[model samples]
Target: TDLSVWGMYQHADIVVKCVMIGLILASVVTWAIFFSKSVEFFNQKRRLKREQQLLAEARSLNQANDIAADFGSKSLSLHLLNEAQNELELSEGSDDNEGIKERTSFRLERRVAAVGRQMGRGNGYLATIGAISPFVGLFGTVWGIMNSFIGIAQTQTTNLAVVAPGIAEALLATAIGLVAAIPAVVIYNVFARQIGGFKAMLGDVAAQVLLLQSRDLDLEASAAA
Candidate 1:
């Protein structure tokens, strides 16, 4: 009676073994995504911090543009800033200051939303793993237990030794499911908060660009007066 995982796996019923294998594979994928996304989120935090600091200190659109350039194309803040700049440029031939406001908000708002959505890309897979792995493992467990009872009926056995192995195999599937699920759930929550913070930061930056542009409109009106 080998109680070791590999030994138990080897002795497990075919369906139970397949369930264990699927659970193991899912667990592997969960950890892999965790490691990769963790690294990526850390990098995002660092970059967004620098971008925020720059935006805080910036008093003009040009300064913000420099900040955007420094952060490079991958920066969502940069996308919003560029959108604002383009809107301002496009409206140059017109004298409608309110038109500037209209275009700036319309152009940049969707982009800001899109950038947030893009930042959230790999997160859904984490969420899916977290939400479904437990059920997947549970299915394996149920199947294993069903087979165990069938085995008991076929063998006419109520003996502890006779019944224990199949039951243990069934239980192991549930255990594997929990193992795969718990960390995925934790990782998903952790990254969810981080991603939310990231989006919030981008929102702030976008608002700053709008504020700077809006102030430019006011300055232009004053000069025209």
Candidate 2:
């Protein structure tokens, strides 16, 4: 471990040491987010895919809820179904048929958007990490270079022993920063695409739901007539 990262860090300036530690911690957080989000995305995909099939088979919102219930109370489709049903429930006895449909549509769209935001929570942090880590590391590097120059000026010597450790520590900041940043960017992009696909699927589910609600409205209208 002669003049290696540990050895170099041991002799690094306090500011440089702080930056390196901070960047390392950031890297840990990045990996943690990646792991947690990956599991969540995969689990959601599996549930939504299966629930969509069951939801399609069901003829109405309550029926869809019943089918989605097989997955659990946490099923995304069940959540959407519950929201739609609640909206309809609130509209009961209202004479505004078209108005109810419009309100239900509004509520459903908002519900989907809200659920999407919930599912996509913590993803923004990955993007932030990816965008900012490199700069943080670069700052560390720049500080290190300045410190090395200051040392050279003070000692009036350009010896490798005096300068090599500082430069190595500086470059380590960049290496660690890249280590944290690259994976975060990749994970963020992957999640972005996955979340987009899920949004489209949610749209499909919502469309099916509105169609059912519309048909139910037509039946009620006919009965009233």
Candidate 3:
């Protein structure tokens, strides 16, 4: 009996074979998502850092808006600026400064939540694969062992040499399952940490915009007084 990996796979029962194939596919998807998300996080982190610097250096909301323009339409900084400006415009001729600030905060918070969801796009798949691949592999292992027991019953042989191959093949399913699950779990953790930092950066940017709005409102009030 050939005990090589391929030989074992070839000798494996159909259900075990299917489990291995599914695990291999899952491993492929995990790496694919890791690479793509890594690139996405890299680009977004750089862009957000740049926006932070630009917004920080600006003296007023108008200057910040001008900076946001350079970042283009899809920029988060630009979106926040526009939302705040829209709130201000909507409240024009009304002396309700607190109400305007509240509305603007609501809009900014909702937008930030949406951005967080978008950034976390493929993480769910990674999480599911990580959580279930082991159990799926265990199912394959259990099935293979059940078949081995049936073979033992029919052959009426409890010989170690004869039963060893079946047990090895069953163990292979678990090995493959761990192979697919480990990297997925590790990558998901990495992405979660990075995304957390990204969200925090976004929160800081939103707070800065809110501060600018507050300053502008105070300036207008003092000028009128």
Best by lDDT: 3
lDDT of 2 by residue, 58-132 (tens): 776566666766677787777777777888789888988898789878988998888778778888788998999
User: In model 2, which runs have C-alpha deviations exceeding 4 angstroms?
Assistant: 69-71, 159-161, 223-225
Report clashes for each candidate as comma-separated counts. 0, 0, 0
Model 1 ranges with Cα > 4 A deviation: none
Clashing pairs in 3: none
- TM-score pick, better of 1 and 2: 1
Model 1 clash pairs are none
> Whole-model Cα lDDT per candidate?
0.80, 0.84, 0.90
Error of 3 at 14 (Å): 0.1
lDDT of 1 by residue, 138-172 (tens): 88778877887888888886776766777787788
Q: Is candidate 2 or candidate 3 better by lDDT?
A: 3
Model 2, CA-based lDDT:
0.84
Ranking, TM-score, top scorer first: 3, 1, 2
**Candidate 3 global CA lDDT score:** 0.90
lDDT by residue for model 3 (93-166), tens: 88878888789889999988889889999999899999999999999999988988899898898877877888
Identify the leading candidate in terms of TM-score. Answer: 3
TM-score of each: 0.91, 0.90, 0.97
